[PDB]
């Protein structure tokens, strides 16, 4: 089966289907930043 490894910079979207709304949008460059 195909391997998908989210191990470098990625964009992220959270959407609600019934309204087709983007609730949150982002890019994760360094997931350990504080």
């Amino acid at each position: 089966h195909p391997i998908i490894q989210i191990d470098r910079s990625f964009m992220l979207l959270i959407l609600e289907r019934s309204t087709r709304s983007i609730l949150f949008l982002g890019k994760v460059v360094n997931p350990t930043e504080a």
Binding site: H1, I3, E16, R17, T19, S21, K27, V29, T32
Partner: protein
């Protein structure tokens, strides 16, 4: 009706990607995270009390064409949008709402107040801005409460002559349709943050059927993880060196295309467990985007108060995200500050 609703969301999504692209200039090669709907919903609420070019500038900056969608349709669509998002969903927590903190001496129109309260999930609080420190704490604690403790200290600085604050908040908490087994999470795995540098993150791992695709035009992998109800997350992984090109291409049109092309099949998936936070001072950005008259001495908010006695002074957003084995919890808040006109 749903035709109007889907138009609001498509326009809102293109605004989301355009603002995203502004952020990629403001804070380049850095984490980005915001709630587009929070920002859009706050500004639409402000526009309810605006008139003439002040009002039109706000909705045009949000992406709307008043020939295609007249002012009153925009108003109805957003009212529908907020209502639908807040409708109870089984084992999904999703709350979006507003709070208006109005100075003791302002003369708000009963119409505007009745409208926001009944049609736009708004609580109205008479606030004594003569104690600016207490007012800031009151607003920050309310936002904290409405975001289930997740958005702390939204307002860092409040102008001493503030006479109104409008806040929108969103809180989201959902379980994955397929939760990860924490016994399979690798405690320290490598994550590439630039060409020569990794950081260590817990890497969750599961083999499952997911909607996924490789976009052959944009050179990116798209992986969808469903929440158990009404909601999903999309992870977009550009091929090496292609993040900039993918960011330039994103639009509502991309999401409409992916909706068609995504296909469910087996994937050996590795996803990091992590939390991030971001804050944005949006005052100047919104001005640059076309919100001009709202800030000026000739601001027209004649629908908000009797005397048209205020103007916009500052705007800011804070958002937080946590992703782990069980699901996702995210929250956001938008702050609009007003002073005497």
């Amino acid at each position: 009706p749903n035709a109007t609703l889907y138009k609001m969301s498509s326009i809102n999504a293109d605004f989301a990607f355009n603002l995203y692209r502004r952020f990629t200039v403001e804070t380049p090669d850095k984490n980005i995270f915001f709630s587009p709907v929070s920002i859009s919903a706050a500004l639409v609420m402000l526009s309810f009390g605006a008139c003439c070019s002040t009002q039109t500038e706000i909705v045009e900056t949000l992406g709307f064409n008043l020939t295609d969608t007249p002012m009153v349709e925009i108003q109805h669509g957003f009212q529908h949008l907020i209502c639908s998002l807040n409708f109870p969903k089984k084992e999904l927590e999703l709350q979006i709402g507003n709070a208006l903190f109005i100075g003791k001496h302002l003369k708000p129109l009963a119409k505007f107040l009745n409208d926001v309260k009944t049609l736009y999930e708004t609580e109205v609080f008479s606030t004594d801005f003569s104690n600016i420190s207490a007012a800031k704490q009151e607003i920050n604690s309310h936002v904290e409460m409405q975001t289930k403790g997740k958005v702390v200290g939204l307002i860092q600085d409040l102008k001493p002559n503030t006479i109104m604050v409008l806040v929108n908040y969103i809180h989201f908490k959902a379980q994955w349709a397929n939760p990860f087994d924490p016994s399979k999470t690798e405690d320290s795995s490598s994550f590439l943050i630039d060409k020569t540098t990794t950081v260590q993150v817990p890497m969750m791992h599961q083999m499952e059927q997911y909607y996924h695709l490789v976009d052959m035009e944009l050179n990116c992998t798209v992986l969808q993880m469903d929440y158990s109800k009404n909601a999903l997350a999309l992870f977009v992984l550009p091929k090496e060196g292609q993040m900039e090109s993918v960011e330039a291409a994103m639009s509502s049109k991309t999401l409409k295309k992916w909706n068609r092309l995504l296909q469910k099949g087996w994937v050996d998936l590795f996803v990091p467990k992590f939390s991030i936070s971001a804050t944005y001072d949006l005052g100047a950005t919104l001005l640059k985007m076309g919100i001009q008259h709202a800030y000026s001495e000739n601001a027209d908010f004649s629908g908000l108060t009797e005397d048209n006695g205020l103007k916009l002074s500052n705007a800011a957003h804070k958002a937080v995200l946590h992703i782990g084995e069980k699901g996702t919890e995210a929250a956001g808040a938008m702050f609009l500050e007003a002073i005497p006109r």
